[PDB]
């Protein structure tokens, strides 16, 4: 008993071009502890890098970078080696992602940090290395008193000149991005007005839980709209108008505070995480990093180098946006939708020449039957992404399969969507997602 809808392609109806380096994941600058996790011998973690893309950023950050220390002198405190920068450019070199680096803006000196920035610069180099950040999330220094409760725009911005210049000294070449947190209007702003030649483009931040005193996410407020991350969105595109500056999403996930269990670690963060990839690139994001690492509840990748790492249900959100690949968003506008308002649909034309539509059929409630109109093919197949319920944990395939050891998947259903009278017809299951590939 499907909600019957319409998606209308227009090839002629042009959106922004999803840029091949879209993908990424953010972890912690803590992770820089052990030459061990971004290493060339982690071989594991590298090949699920590989499958979300053959472009990416790897960011690394997060509020442990207020209390990491390089330590070029070196074989809460963690302290970051040589052999680790050595050892994260080999990473880079195995996953061919591009690298945000955090820099010690919270607790460690200029000096520092121009001299972790010259030994990144010198190991790492130009090509590989998108930018350096000076802290993570500065506007929240003062909640676990990283600075006084008075830190604001100016303090930081004064902050930020110093490791700046200090930076440059050592390393003339050396690119950077920020502020690194969410779009607000005392700090984002500001920064990109005041540093708009300094930084390469702007980094913000986004979690769909709001302040702590919103009720409890849910699966279900997840598949909603976030009005506020419209709001935000729009803030940041203003911002690339007035500065030039485009935005990345450096650090995002569902829940924050290492995610909420039966929320973040479920497939329902597949179906947001993939959703949320296509709405940002339709509003002009040049790309996004997901949170994680170790055994967090809304890490994409779970494990560890002796253990191994596996890929957590919202790798697979993820694993379908890789599949789609890269291309030009095309208008694909829903019909008779309304009692199925939580599936949303994108269009592209693929690098390759080849139309591609994903779907994120959220409602949990309402399967769809979606009457596709605007594509000439002979013929088009579908992969789906699935689970047996939308708080699963487990059980999550796309294409028929699992992701296996060290990110390997091919996909083992194969499914055509009937075509008719230049139309064709798709049946999605509540709580369930689509990839179609047009012949
Ligand atoms: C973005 C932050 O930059 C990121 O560090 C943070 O996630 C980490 O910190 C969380 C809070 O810990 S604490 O209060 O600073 O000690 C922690 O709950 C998360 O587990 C941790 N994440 C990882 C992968 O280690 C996130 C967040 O989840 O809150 C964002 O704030």
Redesign the pocket.
């Given at each position: 008993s499907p909600v019957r809808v319409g998606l209308s392609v227009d090839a002629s109806a042009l959106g922004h071009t999803i840029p091949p380096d879209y993908t990424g994941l953010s972890?912690?600058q803590?992770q820089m502890a052990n030459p061990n996790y971004f290493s060339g011998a982690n071989t594991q973690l590298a090949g699920f890098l590989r499958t979300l893309g053959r472009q990416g950023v790897l960011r690394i950050?997060?509020?442990?970078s207020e209390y990491t220390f390089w330590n070029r002198h070196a074989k809460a405190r963690e302290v970051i080696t040589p052999e680790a920068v050595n050892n994260l450019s080999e990473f880079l070199d195995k996953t061919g992602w591009k690298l945000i680096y955090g820099l010690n803006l919270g607790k460690g000196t200029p000096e520092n940090a121009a001299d972790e920035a010259a030994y990144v610069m010198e190991t790492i180099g130009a090509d590989r290395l998108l930018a350096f950040q000076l802290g993570?999330?500065p506007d929240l220094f003062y909640r676990?008193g990283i600075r006084p409760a008075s830190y604001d725009f100016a303090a930081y911005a004064g902050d930020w000149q110093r490791f700046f210049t200090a930076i440059r000294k050592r390393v003339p070449n050396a690119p950077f991005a920020g502020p690194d947190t969410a779009y607000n209007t005392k700090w984002l702003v500001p920064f990109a007005d005041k540093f708009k030649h300094d930084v390469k483009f702007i980094s913000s931040?986004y979690?769909a839980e709001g302040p702590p005193t919103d009720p409890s996410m849910t699966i279900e407020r997840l598949m909603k709209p976030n009005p506020r991350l419209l709001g935000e969105t729009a803030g940041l595109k203003q911002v690339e108008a007035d500065t030039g500056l485009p935005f990345r999403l450096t650090?995002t996930?569902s829940?924050?505070?290492?995610?909420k269990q039966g929320v973040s670690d479920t497939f329902a963060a597949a179906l947001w995480a993939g959703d949320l990839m296509y709405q940002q690139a339709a509003a002009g994001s040049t790309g996004i990093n997901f949170?994680?690492?170790?055994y967090?509840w809304?890490?994409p990748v779970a494990g560890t180098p002796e253990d191994g790492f596996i890929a957590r249900p919202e790798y697979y959100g993820m694993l379908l946006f890789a599949q789609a690949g890269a291309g030009q968003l095309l208008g694909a506008k829903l019909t008779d939708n309304s009692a199925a308002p939580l599936l949303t649909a994108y269009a592209l034309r693929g690098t390759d020449g080849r139309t591609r539509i994903a779907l994120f059929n959220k409602n949990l409630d309402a399967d769809v039957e979606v009457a596709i109109s605007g594509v000439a093919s002979p013929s088009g197949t579908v992969l789906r992404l699935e689970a047996p319920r939308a708080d699963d944990t487990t059980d999550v395939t796309f294409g028929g399969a699992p992701v296996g050891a060290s990110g390997s998947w091919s996909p083992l259903v194969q499914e055509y969507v009937p075509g008719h009278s230049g139309q064709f017809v798709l049946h999605m299951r509540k709580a369930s997602g689509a990839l179609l590939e047009f012949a």
């Open positions: 972890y912690e803590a950050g997060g509020n442990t993570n999330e676990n931040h979690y650090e996930n829940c924050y505070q290492g995610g949170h994680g690492g170790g967090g809304y890490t």
